[PDB]
Scaffold this motif. Structure first.
Motif, PDB file in Angstrom:
ATOM      1  N   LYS A 135     -30.835  13.826  14.523  1.00  8.84           N
ATOM      2  CA  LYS A 135     -30.123  14.833  15.307  1.00  8.84           C
ATOM      3  C   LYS A 135     -28.613  14.672  15.183  1.00  8.84           C
ATOM      4  O   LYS A 135     -27.891  15.660  15.008  1.00  8.84           O
ATOM      5  CB  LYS A 135     -30.543  14.774  16.774  1.00  8.84           C
ATOM      6  N   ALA A 136     -28.116  13.436  15.279  1.00 16.49           N
ATOM      7  CA  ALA A 136     -26.676  13.211  15.230  1.00 16.49           C
ATOM      8  C   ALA A 136     -26.093  13.683  13.906  1.00 16.49           C
ATOM      9  O   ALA A 136     -25.001  14.261  13.869  1.00 16.49           O
ATOM     10  CB  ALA A 136     -26.366  11.732  15.457  1.00 16.49           C
ATOM     11  N   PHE A 137     -26.809  13.445  12.804  1.00 18.67           N
ATOM     12  CA  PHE A 137     -26.372  13.946  11.505  1.00 18.67           C
ATOM     13  C   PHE A 137     -26.410  15.467  11.437  1.00 18.67           C
ATOM     14  O   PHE A 137     -25.448  16.098  10.983  1.00 18.67           O
ATOM     15  CB  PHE A 137     -27.251  13.356  10.402  1.00 18.67           C
ATOM     16  N   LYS A 138     -27.514  16.077  11.876  1.00 15.42           N
ATOM     17  CA  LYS A 138     -27.635  17.528  11.751  1.00 15.42           C
ATOM     18  C   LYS A 138     -26.577  18.226  12.594  1.00 15.42           C
ATOM     19  O   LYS A 138     -26.040  19.268  12.201  1.00 15.42           O
ATOM     20  CB  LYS A 138     -29.046  17.980  12.133  1.00 15.42           C
ATOM     21  N   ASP A 139     -26.273  17.665  13.766  1.00 16.31           N
ATOM     22  CA  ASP A 139     -25.252  18.201  14.654  1.00 16.31           C
ATOM     23  C   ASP A 139     -23.840  18.075  14.097  1.00 16.31           C
ATOM     24  O   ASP A 139     -22.929  18.717  14.630  1.00 16.31           O
ATOM     25  CB  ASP A 139     -25.312  17.477  16.000  1.00 16.31           C
ATOM     26  N   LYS A 140     -23.628  17.276  13.052  1.00 20.75           N
ATOM     27  CA  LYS A 140     -22.293  17.078  12.506  1.00 20.75           C
ATOM     28  C   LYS A 140     -22.057  17.774  11.176  1.00 20.75           C
ATOM     29  O   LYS A 140     -20.934  17.722  10.662  1.00 20.75           O
ATOM     30  CB  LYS A 140     -22.010  15.580  12.358  1.00 20.75           C
ATOM     31  N   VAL A 141     -23.072  18.412  10.592  1.00 25.28           N
ATOM     32  CA  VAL A 141     -22.918  19.121   9.329  1.00 25.28           C
ATOM     33  C   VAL A 141     -23.660  20.447   9.431  1.00 25.28           C
ATOM     34  O   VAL A 141     -24.547  20.631  10.267  1.00 25.28           O
ATOM     35  CB  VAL A 141     -23.414  18.315   8.100  1.00 25.28           C
ATOM     36  N   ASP A 142     -23.267  21.383   8.568  1.00 24.79           N
ATOM     37  CA  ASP A 142     -23.897  22.699   8.526  1.00 24.79           C
ATOM     38  C   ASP A 142     -25.169  22.692   7.683  1.00 24.79           C
ATOM     39  O   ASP A 142     -26.264  22.974   8.183  1.00 24.79           O
ATOM     40  CB  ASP A 142     -22.901  23.735   7.996  1.00 24.79           C
TER      41      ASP A 142
ATOM     42  N   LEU B 283     -41.215   4.606   2.973  1.00 24.10           N
ATOM     43  CA  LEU B 283     -42.307   5.227   3.710  1.00 24.10           C
ATOM     44  C   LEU B 283     -43.531   4.319   3.749  1.00 24.10           C
ATOM     45  O   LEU B 283     -44.355   4.429   4.662  1.00 24.10           O
ATOM     46  CB  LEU B 283     -42.658   6.570   3.069  1.00 24.10           C
ATOM     47  N   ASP B 284     -43.667   3.433   2.768  1.00 26.20           N
ATOM     48  CA  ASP B 284     -44.826   2.569   2.599  1.00 26.20           C
ATOM     49  C   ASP B 284     -44.516   1.168   3.131  1.00 26.20           C
ATOM     50  O   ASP B 284     -43.371   0.833   3.444  1.00 26.20           O
ATOM     51  CB  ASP B 284     -45.261   2.524   1.129  1.00 26.20           C
ATOM     52  N   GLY B 285     -45.558   0.345   3.238  1.00 24.56           N
ATOM     53  CA  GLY B 285     -45.406  -1.020   3.709  1.00 24.56           C
ATOM     54  C   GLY B 285     -45.454  -1.238   5.206  1.00 24.56           C
ATOM     55  O   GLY B 285     -45.183  -2.358   5.657  1.00 24.56           O
ATOM     56  N   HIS B 286     -45.783  -0.217   5.991  1.00 25.64           N
ATOM     57  CA  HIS B 286     -45.828  -0.337   7.443  1.00 25.64           C
ATOM     58  C   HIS B 286     -46.625   0.850   7.969  1.00 25.64           C
ATOM     59  O   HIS B 286     -46.931   1.788   7.231  1.00 25.64           O
ATOM     60  CB  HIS B 286     -44.426  -0.399   8.062  1.00 25.64           C
ATOM     61  N   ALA B 287     -46.955   0.800   9.256  1.00 28.59           N
ATOM     62  CA  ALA B 287     -47.841   1.794   9.848  1.00 28.59           C
ATOM     63  C   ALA B 287     -47.109   3.011  10.396  1.00 28.59           C
ATOM     64  O   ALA B 287     -47.763   3.938  10.884  1.00 28.59           O
ATOM     65  CB  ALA B 287     -48.672   1.154  10.966  1.00 28.59           C
ATOM     66  N   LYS B 288     -45.780   3.033  10.330  1.00 28.81           N
ATOM     67  CA  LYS B 288     -44.970   3.962  11.103  1.00 28.81           C
ATOM     68  C   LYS B 288     -44.462   5.142  10.277  1.00 28.81           C
ATOM     69  O   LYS B 288     -43.551   5.848  10.720  1.00 28.81           O
ATOM     70  CB  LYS B 288     -43.795   3.198  11.716  1.00 28.81           C
ATOM     71  N   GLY B 289     -45.014   5.354   9.080  1.00 25.91           N
ATOM     72  CA  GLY B 289     -44.524   6.423   8.221  1.00 25.91           C
ATOM     73  C   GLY B 289     -44.708   7.813   8.802  1.00 25.91           C
ATOM     74  O   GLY B 289     -43.816   8.660   8.708  1.00 25.91           O
ATOM     75  N   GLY B 290     -45.866   8.063   9.417  1.00 19.95           N
ATOM     76  CA  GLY B 290     -46.131   9.366  10.014  1.00 19.95           C
ATOM     77  C   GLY B 290     -45.197   9.727  11.153  1.00 19.95           C
ATOM     78  O   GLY B 290     -44.771  10.878  11.278  1.00 19.95           O
ATOM     79  N   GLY B 291     -44.879   8.754  12.005  1.00 16.65           N
ATOM     80  CA  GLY B 291     -43.898   8.982  13.053  1.00 16.65           C
ATOM     81  C   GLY B 291     -42.539   9.419  12.539  1.00 16.65           C
ATOM     82  O   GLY B 291     -41.926  10.335  13.091  1.00 16.65           O
ATOM     83  N   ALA B 292     -42.049   8.772  11.480  1.00 22.87           N
ATOM     84  CA  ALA B 292     -40.758   9.157  10.915  1.00 22.87           C
ATOM     85  C   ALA B 292     -40.766  10.600  10.421  1.00 22.87           C
ATOM     86  O   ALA B 292     -39.849  11.372  10.725  1.00 22.87           O
ATOM     87  CB  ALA B 292     -40.378   8.200   9.784  1.00 22.87           C
ATOM     88  N   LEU B 293     -41.795  10.988   9.660  1.00 20.25           N
ATOM     89  CA  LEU B 293     -41.815  12.334   9.093  1.00 20.25           C
ATOM     90  C   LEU B 293     -41.894  13.394  10.187  1.00 20.25           C
ATOM     91  O   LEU B 293     -41.241  14.440  10.096  1.00 20.25           O
ATOM     92  CB  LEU B 293     -42.978  12.480   8.111  1.00 20.25           C
ATOM     93  N   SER B 294     -42.699  13.146  11.223  1.00 19.73           N
ATOM     94  CA  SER B 294     -42.851  14.123  12.294  1.00 19.73           C
ATOM     95  C   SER B 294     -41.636  14.137  13.215  1.00 19.73           C
ATOM     96  O   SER B 294     -41.321  15.175  13.807  1.00 19.73           O
ATOM     97  CB  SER B 294     -44.120  13.833  13.096  1.00 19.73           C
ATOM     98  N   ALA B 295     -40.954  12.996  13.345  1.00 19.18           N
ATOM     99  CA  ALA B 295     -39.725  12.930  14.129  1.00 19.18           C
ATOM    100  C   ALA B 295     -38.618  13.761  13.492  1.00 19.18           C
ATOM    101  O   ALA B 295     -37.932  14.529  14.174  1.00 19.18           O
ATOM    102  CB  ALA B 295     -39.280  11.476  14.292  1.00 19.18           C
ATOM    103  N   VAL B 296     -38.432  13.613  12.178  1.00 11.64           N
ATOM    104  CA  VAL B 296     -37.409  14.377  11.467  1.00 11.64           C
ATOM    105  C   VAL B 296     -37.726  15.865  11.505  1.00 11.64           C
ATOM    106  O   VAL B 296     -36.835  16.698  11.715  1.00 11.64           O
ATOM    107  CB  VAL B 296     -37.272  13.865  10.021  1.00 11.64           C
TER     108      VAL B 296
END
Length: 290
Positions: free
Chosen positions: A228-235, A244-257
């Protein structure tokens, strides 16, 4: 698949549903529970998991069932569709225009990602664009990678203030009729304050057509605040996710973005220059479940 653990859980739930002797709301909720649990175990934010469940229940109307669908398959397509939404920003990402000069600036924090500048340049070169590299790394791996791929890369020898280097570099390559002019920012910042400070300094000087934020996906759903902070600072904002690999949290990152409506255009999948792919949401989810 890179999200195999989430996908194995989802395809199991769907298989249990498709084998039920009779399909009813009790059976349907079991599968939704199983799917939602899988998403939380993938670090998808509770708000987004609850929203998915609502949408699937709103989309499936079993009682008057329009003929032609085999509804077990309809329930599957409903889940499939909602997984694609969960990872889709809902916005078309910027693309360079052929026969135009495109200045592309990359931004990212420490540890967010190996030098990924070269992969995008190699990608476009391989697609027949006349491409080039501009170095914001500090002058005083990347050089050798540029030599290996034979792509001219700005070294930084004459001057220590990076904004002038970027400005001068874009001019030199615009004069030589390059179509893709790729500007690398610093990977050398741990705080957003100093990163976005230099980001606006260089941007004003070179007027990029697109700014790419490179994010370490291993932090999972905490990527949302960072995006959000990045998107709010650029057009014109784009995101490339690495690790994305090597951990269980890849899906959270993609859905968060995707929740911030910032499009992820590529994923970085390893140390090598071709470990790199465009992010197409529908094929991504299909191969996971198939």
């Amino acid at each position: 698949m890179v999200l195999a653990d989430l996908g194995r859980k989802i395809t199991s739930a769907l298989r249990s549903l498709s084998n039920a002797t009779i399909i009813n709301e009790e059976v349907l909720n079991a599968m939704l529970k199983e799917v939602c649990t899988a998403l939380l175990e993938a670090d998808v934010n509770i708000k987004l998991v609850k929203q998915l469940r609502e949408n699937v229940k709103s989309a499936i109307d079993l009682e008057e069932m329009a003929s032609g669908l085999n509804k077990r398959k309809m329930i599957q397509h409903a889940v499939f569709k909602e997984l694609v939404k969960l990872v889709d920003p809902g916005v078309k990402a910027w693309t360079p225009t052929k026969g135009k000069q495109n200045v592309i600036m990359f931004v990212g924090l420490q540890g967010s990602g190996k030098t990924t500048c070269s992969k995008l340049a190699y990608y476009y070169q391989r697609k027949g664009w006349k491409t080039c590299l501009i170095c914001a790394d500090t002058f005083r791996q990347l050089k050798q990678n540029a030599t290996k791929a034979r792509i001219p890369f700005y070294g930084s020898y004459t001057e220590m203030d990076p904004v002038i280097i970027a400005s001068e570099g874009v001019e030199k390559f615009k004069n030589e009729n390059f179509e893709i002019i790729i500007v690398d920012t610093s990977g050398r910042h741990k705080q957003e304050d100093s990163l976005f400070e230099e980001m606006l300094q260089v941007a004003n000087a070179i007027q990029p057509d697109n700014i790419v934020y490179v994010m370490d996906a291993s932090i999972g759903q905490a990527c949302e605040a960072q995006a959000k902070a990045f998107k709010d600072k650029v057009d014109v904002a784009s995101v490339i996710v690495t690790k994305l690999d090597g951990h269980a949290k890849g899906g959270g990152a993609l859905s968060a973005v995707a929740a911030t409506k910032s499009p992820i255009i590529f994923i970085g999948t390893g140390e090598h220059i071709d470990d790199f792919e465009p992010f197409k949401t529908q094929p991504f989810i299909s191969k996971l479940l198939g």
